[PDB]
Structure 1
């Protein structure tokens, strides 16, 4: 036996936390410093750019909080990349860069800032900040939201951040936690970052497995042999993907029709049904004990 800690008194004194806290999704201590606007602004949105890394997806959204819940003003998913050229490799650093770039260019041509603030067209790898142009509508500002991801040097959240900055979103940041940062000498090489953006870290390991052994290469990159993805095709493929994002980042929905409207879920049992169930269980127990 044990001394039962979880008693009726324990459940009476027990206070639950918030719903997203119990699910394990929201850092409220982080969001209380992120999302609240100063009160001398009185109505303005405070735009945050949320990056969430999934095992098979990358979600990059731009939102602002209201009292009835926040409203997404723009969204971008990493599974929109087969519409642009990236057939496979939807969850790596280059896909995060393309998702952030698509988010930025979609927000710019939905607000009307397509021609003004072109961003970094020719990708270099250095530091970049979007400066406000006088006589023009100002540059969009938003603040990054990494959520519950440990932000070390070389994160896909920061890759999507660099993609949004190269798309033209005026986000305050630093080159300290971009990949390529030297930890013991504290300078930014700005060429290793270009290799990570263009995807040479994956292609060099493809070449390494190709010279090591064919079976482990196939096991690691089975859908890179599928659709004919060679390591020499990789940089030109991401160049064509970036060009496709810059020439057409607008989004189209789909005509959701022809739904049979059936119920895959089990409906809820009612009061008379539960009372009849427990009455039948009592009667069945009495009928079982009136036998011997």
Structure 2
């Protein structure tokens, strides 16, 4: 009957596949080439990006500069290592994104050796107000660009929580404070969410509403014994314990082979056996 199938060989002979990552759905090659393009008169001077990618369970932040061979990672920091600094649950909070970003800033400056003159802010009362590192003596701060990727930039997005942590750590990231958790009200609106105030106001509300819902949403929090009054102080100490030891910490990897390719001899024999089966069958 009618098929008029538009998938015939004449269709493929002129098909033009997209770029592999764009074909995969991971990279926007129209904004990437704007974040990559170093000035041509600055020969081989790296251009750095904060690659902030949030999975379902971690906050991957990296510092990368691009080359023809590939992208090279100068530094990295994950939220899965926050338990070393005292945060065991809620690794993707707006509060845990600030720690991941701030840990990356202090890990980086320790590598370059500029961590003693570039300190940012440290007190907890200034977590809500805009801070951008400035010139110390006559040495500019480390400048970096925020690569967000395929993430919408709304007025609460965590990719700007990571950016706020980096600027608080003493690394210069050009920005505006119009997309943070604040951008409205004032510092304490921004400060509260940085300290987990939005998480430690839902445990209390849920506990008032229902016990099933409270144990369904915060099941592992109850087992860990984290009261809704301990989260705010937990992140205060985690911040204190990062500015004192950010420089990393601490075998055989078990492989699991999957199929391995069939050789020409095995592949050819499969046809011959099937051909022989067809002869006797028919």
TM-score interval, smaller chain: over 0.9
Shift of 1:262: 5.4
| 1:262–1:164 CA distance, 2 compared to 1 (3 A) | closer
Shift of 1:97: 0.4
The equivalent residue for 1:50 is 51
Shift of 1:2: 2.5
The equivalent residue for 1:146 is 148
Q: Give the structure-2-normalised TM-score.
A: 0.96
The equivalent residue for 1:185 is none
Structure 1 CA distance for aligned equivalents of residues 229 and 86 of structure 2: 16
Q: Secondary structure at the match of 2:13?
A: helix
Select 2:274's aligned residue among 258, 265, 281.
Answer: 281
The equivalent residue for 2:163 is 161
Query: Which aligned pairs between 1:198-209 and structure 2 lie closer than 5 A?
Result: 198-209=195-206
Shift of 1:251: 0.4
The equivalent residue for 2:213 is 216
The equivalent residue for 1:92 is 93
Gaps of 5+ in 2: none
Structure 2 CA distance for aligned equivalents of residues 84 and 212 of structure 1: 33
Deviation string 1:244-275 (CA, Å, 9 cap, x unpaired) is: 1111111034xx24x5x655221110111111
Q: Give the structure-1-normalised TM-score.
A: 0.93
User: Does residue 266 of the first structure (1) align with residue 259 of the second (2)?
Assistant: yes
The runs of at least 4 aligned residues of structure 1 exceeding 2 Å deviation read: 261-264
Structure 1 CA distance for aligned equivalents of residues 88 and 204 of structure 2: 20
Select 1:129's aligned residue among 122, 128, 132.
Answer: 132
Structure 2 CA distance for aligned equivalents of residues 77 and 233 of structure 1: 23
Structure 2 CA distance for aligned equivalents of residues 90 and 263 of structure 1: 29
The equivalent residue for 2:183 is 181
Question: RMSD of the TM alignment (CA)?
Answer: 1.2
